[PDB]
Amino acid sequence: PQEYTLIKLKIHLIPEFLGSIVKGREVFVVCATLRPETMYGQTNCWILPDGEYDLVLAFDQVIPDGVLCKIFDKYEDTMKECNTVYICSERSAYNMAYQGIVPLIHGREQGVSDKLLPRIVSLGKVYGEQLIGTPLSAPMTPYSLIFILPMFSISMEKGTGIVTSVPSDSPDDYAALRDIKTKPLLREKYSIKDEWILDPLEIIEVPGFGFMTAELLCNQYKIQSQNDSAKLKQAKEEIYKKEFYEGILIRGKYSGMKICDAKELIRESLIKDGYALIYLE
């Protein structure tokens, strides 16, 4: 029952097809991480192309034993406290509703019965593929626009089904990004443009590994595709732990600190500046 940082990546250019649905509201794509420290190295964002994601109305402010949420009679009642849209899985939007991050509204249950059934405010459904190439304004990374690209190893059953890419220090991200870089047939299939593919960033030094720890571990485990999920799971646990203790930040406000010393502060800052939320799951 764990504490995630939910990172907000703002859509920088709203696709035509979503302009009617969105209506001058700020839209953010949202992703859950355990490693806010790593957000200095975002190169892209990852989405499941066949995944179905909702455009979910959300509270502008959150109030961060157990937790509150709010219900309203109708869509029109929320427009006061809610001028914000999050793209995410329906599943994860329900979790956010039950922690007070999105509004609920009075729905009536299907069928013969009267029973009150709380619903989120979905403005529409969208497939991931329809968002590939979308520019996002990402917090902390010095590339400051980054793009949505496809990753086929994403589970819709976890987080929001949309994920951050730090190929410098995430084996999954290294692997999915290398699959894009080295498979021209795959680029052509998703109309991937060369300018959407940004290089890894040097952000975290680990004694004996340097600044591309994910690439070295992928090699050491012999990870050949983003689909090698036993090896990736294992390697993800290794890098996590290794970087927690031995990793040194070489970027941003807290450069020169060990990650175990800076992680909390970095996370506090993200929540305080509005770049992220706490999300339990």
Residue numbers in the entry: 255 to 318, 325 to 541
Q: Mind quoting what the paper says about this structure?
A:
AARSs play an essential role in protein synthesis by charging tRNAs with their cognate amino acids. Similar to other LeuRSs, the C. muris LeuRS contains a predicted editing domain exhibiting highly conserved motifs that are important for the hydrolysis of tRNALeu mischarged with noncognate amino acids, such as isoleucine or norvaline, while excluding cognate Leu-tRNALeu. The structures show the typical seven-β-strand and three-α-helix fold of the LeuRS connective polypeptide domain (CP1), plus archaeon/eukaryote-specific insertions, denoted I1ae, I2ae, I3ae, and I4ae.
Despite predicted flexibility, the three insertions are, in fact, ordered and include well-defined secondary structure elements. Iax3 consists of a β-tongue structure which connects the α-helix (αae1) and the third β-sheet (βae3) of I2ae. Interestingly, Iax3 has a well-defined β-sheet in the apo-structure, whereas all the holo-structures show a significantly different conformation with shifts of up to 8.9 Å. Another difference between the apo- and holo-structures is the position of helices α1 and α2 adjacent to I4ae at the editing site, which needs to open (∼1.5 Å) to accommodate ligands. Overall, the CmLeuRS insertions are 25 to 45 Å distant from the editing site and thus are presumably not directly involved in posttransfer editing, although we cannot exclude this possibility in the context of the full-length protein and tRNA.
